[PDB]
Design a protein around this ligand. Structure first.
Ligand SMILES: CCCCCCCCCCCCCC(=O)O[C@H](COC(=O)CCCCCCCCCC)COP(=O)(O)OCC[N+](C)(C)C
Ligand SMILES: CCCCCCCCCCCCCC(=O)O[C@H](COC(=O)CCCCCCCCCC)COP(=O)(O)OCC[N+](C)(C)C
Ligand SMILES: C[C@H]1CC[C@]2(OC1)O[C@H]1[C@H](O)[C@@H]3[C@H]4CC[C@@H]5C[C@H](O[C@H]6O[C@@H](CO)[C@H](O)[C@@H](O)[C@@H]6O)[C@@H](O)C[C@@]5(C)[C@@H]4CC[C@@]3(C)[C@@H]1[C@H]2C
Ligand SMILES: C[C@H]1CC[C@]2(OC1)O[C@H]1[C@H](O)[C@@H]3[C@H]4CC[C@@H]5C[C@H](O[C@H]6O[C@@H](CO)[C@H](O)[C@@H](O)[C@@H]6O)[C@@H](O)C[C@@]5(C)[C@@H]4CC[C@@]3(C)[C@@H]1[C@H]2C
Ligand SMILES: [Mg+2]
Lengths: 37, 30, 33, 78
C-alpha cells in the first residue's frame, strides 16, 4: 500500500548545467544584434 | 530619435502599466 | 504562491512608478511642444 | 523489460524554468519595443519591409518561447 523511499533527482549538476541554457540564449541574442549590417 | 515616437511609446507604456496596476490591485481576495 | 505583503509592495511600487511616468510625460511634452 | 530502460528526465532541468523565462522574456520585450518604435517614427516611403519582417520574426520567436516557459513555470505543463 505504501510505496517506499523517494528517488533523488538525476537532473543536473551545478556550475555547468544550470547556466548552460541561459548562456545559449545570450549567445544567440548577441549575433542577432549583429544583422544590422 | 524624434520626440514624437518616444512620446507615443511613453503613452503606450503608461497605459499598459495603468492596466496592470488596475488588474493587480484587485487580487487581495484571490 | 504570492503572499499578501509581496503583492501589497508590488501595488505600491507600481503606483509610484505610474505617477513618476505621468510627471515625466508632462515634462517632456511641455519642454518640447 | 522495465529493467533495461532508464528513468525519464525532462529535457530542461525544472529548477531553471524561472531563470530561463525572464531571460527569454526580457529580450523578447526589448525586441518588440524596437519594432514598435520603428513603426512610429517612419514615413511610408522610408519604411523597409524586410527589416519589419525580420524584427517581427525574431521578437515573435523569443516572445513565444518565453511565453511557453512562463506557462510551464506556473504549473500548466503543456
Ligand atoms: C494594451 C493597451 C495599450 C493602448 C494602446 C495605445 C497605443 C498608443 C500609441 C498610439 C500612437 C500611434 C501614432 C501613429 O500615428 O502610428 C500609426 C500606426 O500605429 C501603430 O504603430 C500601432 C497600430 C496598432 C493598431 C492595432 C491594429 C489592429 C487592427 C489592424 C487591422 C502610424 O503613424 P504614421 O504612419 O507615421 O502617420 C504619419 C506621421 N504623422 C505624424 C504625420 C501622423
Ligand atoms: C523588467 C523585467 C520584466 C521581465 C518580464 C517578467 C515577467 C515574468 C513575471 C511572471 C512571474 C510569475 C509569478 C510566479 O511564478 O509565482 C508562481 C505563482 O503562480 C501564480 O498563480 C501566479 C500566475 C500569474 C503570472 C501570470 C503573468 C503573465 C502576464 C500575462 C498578463 C509560483 O507558483 P508555484 O507555487 O511555484 O508553482 C509551481 C509548483 N508546482 C507544483 C505547481 C509545479
Ligand atoms: C532561442 C532559445 C530557444 C530555447 C533554447 O534556448 C535558445 O534552445 C534550446 C536548444 O534546443 C537546447 C537543447 C539542444 C539539444 C540538447 C541535447 C543534449 O543531449 C542535451 O544535453 C541538451 C539539449 C536538450 C539542449 C538543452 C537546452 C535547449 C533545449 C535550449 C533552450 C534553452
Ligand atoms: C524592457 C524595455 C527596456 C527599454 C526599451 O524597451 C524595452 O528597450 C530599448 C532598446 O534598447 C531599444 C533600442 C534598440 C536598438 C536601437 C538602435 C537604433 O540605432 C536606435 O535608433 C534605436 C534603438 C536604440 C532602440 C530604441 C528603443 C529602445 C532604446 C528600447 C526601450 C524602449
Ligand atoms: Mg508534450
Amino acid at each position: 500500500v505504501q510505496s517506499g523511499p523517494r528517488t533523488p533527482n538525476p537532473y543536473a549538476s551545478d556550475n555547468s548545467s544550470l547556466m548552460f541554457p541561459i548562456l545559449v540564449a545570450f549567445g544567440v541574442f548577441i549575433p542577432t544584434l549583429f544583422c544590422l549590417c | 530619435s524624434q520626440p514624437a515616437g518616444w512620446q507615443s511609446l511613453l503613452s503606450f507604456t503608461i497605459l499598459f502599466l495603468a492596466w496592470l496596476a488596475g488588474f493587480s490591485s484587485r487580487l487581495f481576495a484571490v | 504562491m504570492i503572499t499578501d505583503v509581496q503583492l501589497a509592495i508590488f501595488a505600491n511600487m507600481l503606483g509610484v512608478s505610474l505617477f513618476l511616468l505621468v510627471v515625466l510625460y508632462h515634462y517632456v511634452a511641455v519642454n518640447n511642444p | 523489460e522495465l529493467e533495461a530502460m532508464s528513468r525519464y528526465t525532462s529535457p530542461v532541468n525544472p529548477a531553471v524554468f524561472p531563470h530561463l523565462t525572464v531571460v527569454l522574456l526580457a529580450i523578447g520585450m526589448f525586441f518588440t519595443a524596437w519594432f514598435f518604435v520603428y513603426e512610429v517614427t517612419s514615413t511610408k516611403y522610408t519604411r523597409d519591409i524586410y527589416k519589419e519582417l525580420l524584427i517581427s520574426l525574431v521578437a515573435s520567436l523569443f516572445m513565444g518561447f518565453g511565453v511557453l516557459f512562463l506557462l510551464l513555470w506556473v504549473g500548466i505543463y503543456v
